[PDB]
Amino acid sequence: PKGTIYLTFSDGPVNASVEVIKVLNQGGVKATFYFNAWHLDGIGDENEDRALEALKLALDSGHIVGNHSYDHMIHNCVEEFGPTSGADCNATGNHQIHSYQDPVRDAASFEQNLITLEKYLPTIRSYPNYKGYELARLPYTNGWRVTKHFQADGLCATSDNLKPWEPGYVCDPANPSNSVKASIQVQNILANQGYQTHGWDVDWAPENWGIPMPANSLTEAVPFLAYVDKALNSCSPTTIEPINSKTQEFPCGTPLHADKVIVLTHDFLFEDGKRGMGATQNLPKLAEFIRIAKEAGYVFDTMDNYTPRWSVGKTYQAGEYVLYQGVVYKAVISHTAQQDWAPSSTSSLWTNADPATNWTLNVSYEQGDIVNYKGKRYLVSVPHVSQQDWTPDTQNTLFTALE
Amino acid sequence: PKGTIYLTFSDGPVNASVEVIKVLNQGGVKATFYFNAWHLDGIGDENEDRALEALKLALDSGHIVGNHSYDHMIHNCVEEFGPTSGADCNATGNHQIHSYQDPVRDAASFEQNLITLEKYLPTIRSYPNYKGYELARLPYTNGWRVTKHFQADGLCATSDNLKPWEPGYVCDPANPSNSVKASIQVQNILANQGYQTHGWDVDWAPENWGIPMPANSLTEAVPFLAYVDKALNSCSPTTIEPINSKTQEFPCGTPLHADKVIVLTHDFLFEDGKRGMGATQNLPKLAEFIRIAKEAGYVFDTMDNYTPRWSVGKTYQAGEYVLYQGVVYKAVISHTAQQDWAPSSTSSLWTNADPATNWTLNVSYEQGDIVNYKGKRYLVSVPHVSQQDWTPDTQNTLFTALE
Numbered sequence A, B: 001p002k003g004t005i006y007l008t009f010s011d012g013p014v015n016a017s018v019e020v021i022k023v024l025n026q027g028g029v030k031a032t033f034y035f036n037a038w039h040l041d042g043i044g045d046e047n048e049d050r051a052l053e054a055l056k057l058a059l060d061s062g063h064i065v066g067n068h069s070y071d072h073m074i075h076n077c078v079e080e081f082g083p084t085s086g087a088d089c090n091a092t093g094n095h096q097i098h099s100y101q102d103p104v105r106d107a108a109s110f111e112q113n114l115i116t117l118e119k120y121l122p123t124i125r126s127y128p129n130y131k132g133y134e135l136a137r138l139p140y141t142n143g144w145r146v147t148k149h150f151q152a153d154g155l156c157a158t159s160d161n162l163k164p165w166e167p168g169y170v171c172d173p174a175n176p177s178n179s180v181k182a183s184i185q186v187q188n189i190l191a192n193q194g195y196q197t198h199g200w201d202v203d204w205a206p207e208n209w210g211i212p213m214p215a216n217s218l219t220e221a222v223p224f225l226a227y228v229d230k231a232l233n234s235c236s237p238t239t240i241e242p243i244n245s246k247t248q249e250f251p252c253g254t255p256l257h258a259d260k261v262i263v264l265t266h267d268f269l270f271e272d273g274k275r276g277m278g279a280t281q282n283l284p285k286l287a288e289f290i291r292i293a294k295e296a297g298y299v300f301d302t303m304d305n306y307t308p309r310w311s312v313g314k315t316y317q318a319g320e321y322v323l324y325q326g327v328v329y330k331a332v333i334s335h336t337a338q339q340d341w342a343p344s345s346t347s348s349l350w351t352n353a354d355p356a357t358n359w360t361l362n363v364s365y366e367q368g369d370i371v372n373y374k375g376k377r378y379l380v381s382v383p384h385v386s387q388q389d390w391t392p393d394t395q396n397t398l399f400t401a402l403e
């Protein structure tokens, strides 16, 4: 394959999601949906009476469902959250202002999302493709928590006053907004709950938001394939525009990212409605893009495989990353995987390489790494692989307490 | 040791919890606390201003924290849940009436509990002894979800009209109340989220909960130790009184329960206050009990070790259970454990034996087992060990879809 494309649809489930999923199915591809369950409650200010139907269709069709928070952080765009808040925020256009405030309350929005999903569809955990408690993406934010060494934030994603185009707008990645700093803490809280978060390389979006039918201007299939060709192995998250979409410290050339392009788009760009004629114009664009991308040598995959699943029989090189049972591991030695030698908290063949900060078992810690343990923070003083006996509060030689 | 005692304290964290924890600490034992976080919000109708202090002390002292639901099901005891609901339910005393109603919303109370704990103590996940998302117990209910074969319900735990100690009360386990049936569905939902749930063998409590001044009728230490002696290997959950505390179909003689006694009591019984002089009378009893139990040969442990952790170097017999990374496994053949060969979804030496009903990999399914998969229910028509390509929707010889 020329590469692997990961289609990711955000902000569903809404009525428009149904035909999107039908087009993916017709095209013989699987995609990943980052959902906001407030649409199931009928308060997300979209056409959403079929939100549940869409959720079931996504899951029955085998697409991956990931977590984008209950309300897309709209509780931080209004004085008091209620049924009108989604519309109130769309009126003021303040989505990107003070988007993140109390990072603990904002991380809790991702759990509330699951409660709601599991309320409207009580059988949802019977679907293996339900990844709501494993994969997430932060609203507005091209931020990543993939492995211990593959992490980076969207340092100008959200603002404390001005929107990115308005005059007087500045962004300093070195000294980011309070909203950004809070979103960074959200990433960390989710990573310690076991989440991976992923941003994107290319945003399939209206090329003109300044007209009354912006959905119509969604990039056509042929040019969009050129954008994808250009993004392949070119570290797109750093060069992407606009500025609030950048991941400034993205680890360019990082092995996990080689020959991959993550596409971001939105279900709501594919309806005939307030943004224009998205269903009539853009459904054919999606069908065509899939057709031509395959013809050009690409394959399509889902974000549960972005970090490849450990596979019996596969040969791994030292330092390669896999996902096993939702946990990221890194190979200690080159070897060939077999049935009884799976990665784990006690394997000598692998170390845990989750993007978490809490002290964790079987992690290769380096001098200078900071870990949390029983409410305190510690520096690692001597490089070592952690084990159950070697807790930071009982190993004052391995760890230096801060703070 | 003569046997292992698991001290378990329910309905905290409250002011009374602090001195309980200090007695445990002075006595040199650890215990397991099944907490209701509504006390942290100040709406639980107990003396509870030191709730967060108690939580922190429990965790800093090495005690295990388990999940007892956010509000002890008080939402099902009132018309509309709010800040006064705890006092309203204490007025009617109707706690054990209609205790469980909508299983989905009742199970969601366990998740809300964790959101609240993780709000008041944002560092809580950095404590290994925080088991809030692994270990639970259902309010009012001596119910068990331990392994695939070790499960049983409290079939008279709660009722649809009369309290168990009122004249005219009847329970038929063969035809359980609606409340009990709903509570069974809550056990099943928690089990599918990866929880184990445990009941108890002996309760340090008044005769029944209808008894006036409950804290003033706890048994003395010496007789209580005698009750623990009698509970050892005697299937107490079947013989225990009163009737609402019984686990009727408890698997007498099940290996995991051998030589163990789980004690239940409540932190609020150790307070000088409305229920009696519980601090003055019962703190000394607890202290004395701990001393004489050790002197008699018992040891004390915590519920995170109730199922024993998998241990490298240990020789296992076919059929033996271990806990590994939060999951229960059962040995396939007698063998000696090696570092790189741990239980997992692909191990040949172990099968997954979580007490869950959703179809799961590497599980030894037996005829008559019913699994959930992608929203549908299937009967296991032929015994086998599940694996990735043997999903119910594609194996109509192994599985039989239900109407």
Ligand SMILES: CC(=O)N[C@@H]1[C@@H](O)[C@H](O[C@@H]2O[C@H](CO)[C@@H](O)[C@H](O)[C@H]2NC(C)=O)[C@@H](CO)O[C@H]1O
Pocket (backbone or CB within 6 Å): B010, B011, B044, B045, B072, B086, B090, B095, B096, B138, B139, B140, B141, B209, B214, B264, B275
């Ligand atoms: C393990 C279990 O669920 N035990 C039950 C007790 O919690 C329960 O007592 C009542 O608990 C409520 C929640 O903490 C209190 O608000 C209430 O005041 C308390 N009642 C009394 C008289 O103290 C009892 C009573 O129904 O039943 C046990 O099964």
Ligand SMILES: [Ca+2]
Pocket (backbone or CB within 6 Å): A133, B133
């Ligand atoms: Ca969880």
Ligand SMILES: [Ca+2]
Pocket (backbone or CB within 6 Å): A134, A194, A195, A196, A326, A327, A328
């Ligand atoms: Ca994970």
Ligand SMILES: [Ca+2]
Pocket (backbone or CB within 6 Å): B134, B194, B195, B196, B326, B327, B328
């Ligand atoms: Ca578990």
Ligand SMILES: [Cl-]
Pocket (backbone or CB within 6 Å): B255, B256, B319, B320, B321
């Ligand atoms: Cl066993």
Ligand SMILES: [Zn+2]
Pocket (backbone or CB within 6 Å): A010, A011, A068, A072, A139, A140
């Ligand atoms: Zn979004």
Ligand SMILES: [Zn+2]
Pocket (backbone or CB within 6 Å): B010, B011, B068, B072, B139, B140
């Ligand atoms: Zn209780």
